[PDB]
Amino acid sequence: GDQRFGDLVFRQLAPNVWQHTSYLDMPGFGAVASNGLIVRDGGRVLVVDTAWTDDQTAQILNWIKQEINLPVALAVVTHAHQDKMGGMDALHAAGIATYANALSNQLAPQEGMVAAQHSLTFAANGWVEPATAPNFGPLKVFYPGPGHTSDNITVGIDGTDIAFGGCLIKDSKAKSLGNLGDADTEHYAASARAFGAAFPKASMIVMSHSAPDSRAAITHTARMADKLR
Ligand SMILES: Cn1c(=O)cc(CP(=O)(O)O)c2cc(F)c(N3CCCC3)cc21
Ligand SMILES: Cn1c(=O)cc(CP(=O)(O)O)c2cc(F)c(N3CCCC3)cc21
Ligand SMILES: [Zn+2]
Ligand SMILES: [Zn+2]
């Protein structure tokens, strides 16, 4: 059961949680999926990650208007790469309050990304400071340490068994840690395990580029990353 709306795919994961999927052609790879989330929280909708492009991100917003018809209160992005932050201007055009790791906002301009309007900071134990993430409701935001990038953050949805590590986590069948261009190979394994320890009851781990996996995706990722220390 996958709903198509223009060039995007939406899959219901839980009564109030959908996965959004957008595609971009990468040389040597064909069509590449990127996933984020849509969370209904009573009278509003929360978005995790843009699509690869502004136009794709506008089609997420049109799907929400058509199928949910509740306002989008806020969007949070998980790191400053095109797949997760490439649609930032589409959210600003729609009057949506946008949030990212302070470091994501620092890195976005050089990456040709638009920074979010708001900078998240994190407590010593990795949990977001609520003063920087006001009104996040069931979105629990966690900085596990550097991994895929120095800025990568993760989210869990309270009231569900769902967590999302973005590009930090690979699926359980992966043969690679993927993009090591911006990665911290020394801390990667510990950051993967920190994410699993932050959401220990999550049984559905949403993947960045493939279908949802089990906690075996977290374990598999940490074991591959163990080999680089
Ligand atoms: C080979 N490969 C993957 O398998 C998975 C991914 C996705 P992720 O695991 O990093 O999230 C990937 C990303 C890249 F940027 C990438 N390069 C970028 C320059 C050319 C190769 C390769 C990747
Ligand atoms: C080639 N390439 C990129 O340049 C950037 C990205 C974005 P990021 O993942 O670094 O944030 C990327 C993601 C993929 F999943 C990907 N594939 C997934 C399996 C095959 C190739 C390639 C990518
Ligand atoms: Zn990335
Ligand atoms: Zn990725």
Curated annotation (Swiss-Prot):
Disulfide bonds: none annotated. It comes from the Bacteria. Its main location: periplasm. Its EC number is 3.5.2.6. GO terms for cellular component: periplasmic space. Inhibits by captopril, thiorphan, dimercaprol and tiopronin. This enzyme is not susceptible to inactivation by the beta-lactamase-blocking agents clavulanic acid. Keywords: Antibiotic resistance, Hydrolase, Metal-binding, Periplasm, Plasmid, Signal, Zinc. It is found in: Periplasm. Its cofactor is Zn(2+). GO terms for molecular function: beta-lactamase activity; zinc ion binding. Substrate binds at K170, N179. GO terms for biological process: antibiotic catabolic process; response to antibiotic. Zn(2+) 2 binds at D83, C167, H209. Monomer. Belongs to the metallo-beta-lactamase superfamily. Class-B beta-lactamase family. This is Metallo-beta-lactamase type 2. The gene is blaNDM-1. The chain holds residues 42 to 270 of 270 of the full protein.
